[PDB]
């Protein structure tokens, strides 16, 4: 929070030491300066103690402050839900950004960096090359900027592989390709490699796949190529290409030609020290493909974020992937925690129990509930750990079952480990309820690769879906051995890069390729269409789960 120059840091200590009496100014100050806003002032008029926070500020989800984003969206002045000016609105859920809290997130952004140094050897010694795209943005019926995290972080080079005008590319394959190339030209200076999320670092790679005989054509001629038309893209990229160089071309061709694209991230980048990439929640489904990319390289996670919030800091960047935990910064804002009618303090929170964090915020939230279950699994410093489960949202429902996120990431976790004796991989996958048949059933779409022209097995197949079955929650498995209100679990297959048509068309609804995360579940009749459109093979559990 104060004045961090770039010496040494021990601010990371004191933040982590003083947690109980950070937390209790973070919320002195928001009811004291927003004691005059109207959500605030009418639940507590003028009152600034958490006693009475506590008995009137009610816990709410984002239905029900809409109301006061709409109305600020539509020109009403930001006291209404902030005394601070509200400097763009996020994205279809809005959230409202102001500037200095912007500028917090960054300044811990730079203080945490120098802990990332001690940790893993070598960091310093060259640049990142991770893969940042902005979204095209709007502006409200007043000219309110209506914008993406990532977009907002990136209107603020030193440490980057990509100069800021190719990051910064309105089309973002062009920038995708010219990031690429650059930092190809650069494989000698690249110390990490990384994106947001493990998906979004994997379509780079896939890109990389399926057009490296470009890249490679660009760096022999040392004339670009022309599918890339954007005058800032093409300038920007002008320092970095220069003269012909036939034999880096060649050292590139290299490994790109070669049967297997194992461990291909060590080989183009041989200086790269770990793989900057979120890996928890649902992107551990991409760990596997990751790991047999990574070539050995570390798996790093740091950050856990919204655009509500910027929460934790995994302080222990070093570690197994399953084993990742996030430490909640007491100083972004005033956290709670919902148990799962029981709302309990960061330091209250009991090691071993799953919450929900309810936040309170410089730029407009008050006892906001972020959407997202965590479990306490421990202490760094007197800072509490968690450990991401899921998205909170039920993800499957018949009628009585509720299956979430992370219990349907574990029974496809548990269950593509049957695939891995021929040398077949789970992709992506994704779900929906079929009330078609009677009784309805789940279904679970799988998009196989491998690592090197293949048919599913069906009777592996058949026990890939008995596997999923055999991992749900009791009420699921009674409902199919006993209730028989539901009916065998079913898998379908789908063509390779099915699920990247899945996502260009969310990005062709307003995603953005940076922030995108495939869904667990899928109910926009839009995107069934495209998933059954690729379907290839379809199986039915053979055998009824136990109970
Ligand atoms: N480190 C992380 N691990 C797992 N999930 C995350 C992490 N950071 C962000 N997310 C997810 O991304 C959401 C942020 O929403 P958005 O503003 O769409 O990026 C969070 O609420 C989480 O569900």
């Given at each position: ?6 010496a ?11 947690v ?9 100050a928001?009811?004291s300066?927003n ?5 605030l002032?009418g ?13 009137n500020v ?5 239905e029900?402050?809409?109301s ?12 209404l ?6 400097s763009?609105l ?12 912007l ?7 730079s203080?945490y ?8 050897d070598?960091?310093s ?6 893969f940042?795209?902005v979204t095209?943005?709007?502006?409200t ?7 993406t ?8 080079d030193?440490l980057?592989?990509?100069?800021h ?25 690249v ?6 999320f493990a998906?979004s670092?994997?379509?780079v ?14 760096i ?5 190529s ?11 990229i ?5 003269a012909?160089?036939p034999?880096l ?12 694209w ?8 041989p200086k790269?020290?770990?793989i900057?990439?979120?890996?928890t929640?649902?992107?551990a ?21 919204s ?5 934790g ?12 935990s ?9 956290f709670?925690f ?6 309990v303090?960061?330091?209250?929170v009991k ?8 936040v ?7 006892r906001?509930?972020?959407?997202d279950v965590?479990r ?6 007197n800072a509490?750990?968690?450990?991401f ?13 509720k ?10 976790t548990?269950?593509?480990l049957?695939?891995?004796p ?5 992709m992506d996958?994704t ?7 009677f009784?309805?059933?789940?279904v ?6 491998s ?6 097995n069906?009777?592996?197949m058949?026990?890939?879906?008995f596997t999923?079955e055999?991992?749900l929650?009791?009420?699921?498995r ?6 028989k ?6 898998i379908?297959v ?6 990247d ?21 899928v109910?926009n009749?839009?995107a ?7 379907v290839?093979?379809?199986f039915?559990?053979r ?5």
């Amino acid at each position: 929070d104060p004045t961090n120059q770039k010496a040494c840091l021990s601010l990371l200590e004191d933040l982590t030491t003083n947690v109980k009496q950070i937390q209790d100014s973070v919320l002195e100050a928001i009811l004291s300066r927003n004691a005059q806003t109207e959500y605030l002032r009418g639940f507590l008029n003028g009152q600034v103690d958490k006693q009475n926070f506590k008995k009137n500020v009610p816990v709410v989800t984002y239905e029900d402050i809409r109301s006061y984003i709409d109305r600020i969206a539509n020109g009403e002045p930001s006291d209404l839900i902030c005394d601070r000016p509200i400097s763009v609105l996020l994205t279809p859920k809005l959230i409202p950004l102001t500037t200095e809290d912007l500028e917090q997130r960054i300044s811990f952004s730079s203080l945490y960096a120098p802990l990332l140094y001690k940790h893993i050897d070598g960091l310093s010694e060259g640049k990142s090359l991770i893969f940042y795209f902005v979204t095209r943005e709007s502006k409200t019926a007043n000219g309110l900027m209506v914008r993406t995290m990532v977009t907002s972080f990136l209107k603020s080079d030193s440490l980057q592989v990509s100069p800021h005008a190719i990051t910064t590319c309105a089309d973002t394959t062009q920038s995708m390709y010219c990031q690429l190339l650059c930092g190809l030209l650069e494989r000698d200076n690249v110390a990490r490699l990384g994106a947001p999320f493990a998906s979004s670092f994997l379509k780079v790679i896939k890109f990389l796949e399926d057009h490296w005989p470009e890249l490679c054509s660009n760096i022999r001629t040392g004339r670009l190529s022309d599918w890339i038309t954007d005058a800032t893209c093409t300038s920007g990229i002008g320092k970095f290409l220069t003269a012909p160089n036939p034999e880096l071309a060649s050292l590139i061709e290299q490994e790109c030609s070669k049967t297997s694209w194992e461990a291909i991230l060590k080989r183009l980048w041989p200086k790269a020290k770990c793989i900057e990439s979120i890996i928890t929640g649902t992107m551990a489904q991409y760990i596997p493909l990751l790991e047999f990319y990574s070539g050995g390289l570390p798996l790093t996670s740091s950050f856990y974020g919204s655009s509500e919030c910027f929460m934790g800091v995994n302080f222990n960047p070093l570690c197994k992937p399953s084993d990742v935990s996030y430490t909640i910064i007491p100083c972004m804002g005033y956290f709670e925690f919902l148990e799962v009618p029981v709302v309990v303090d960061l330091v209250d929170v009991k090691i071993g129990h799953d919450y929900e964090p309810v936040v309170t915020t410089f730029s407009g939230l008050y006892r906001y509930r972020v959407g997202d279950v965590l479990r306490a699994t421990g202490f760094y410093n007197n800072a509490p750990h968690f450990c991401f489960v899921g998205r909170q949202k039920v993800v499957l429902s018949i009628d009585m079952d509720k299956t979430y996120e992370d219990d349907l990431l574990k029974a496809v976790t548990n269950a593509k480990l049957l695939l891995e004796p021929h040398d077949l991989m789970l992709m992506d996958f994704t779900s929906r309820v079929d009330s078609s048949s009677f009784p309805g059933h789940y279904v679970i779409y799988w998009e196989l690769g491998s690592k090197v022209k293949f048919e599913p097995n069906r009777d592996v197949m058949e026990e890939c879906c008995f596997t999923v079955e055999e991992s749900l929650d009791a009420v699921y498995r009674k409902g199919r051995k006993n209730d028989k209100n539901i009916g065998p679990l079913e898998i379908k297959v789908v063509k390779p890069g099915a699920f990247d048509e899945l996502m260009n068309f969310f990005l062709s609804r307003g995603s953005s390729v940076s922030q995108y995360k495939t869904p667990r579940s899928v109910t926009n009749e839009e995107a069934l269409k495209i998933l059954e459109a690729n379907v290839i093979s379809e199986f039915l559990s053979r055998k009824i789960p136990s109970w």
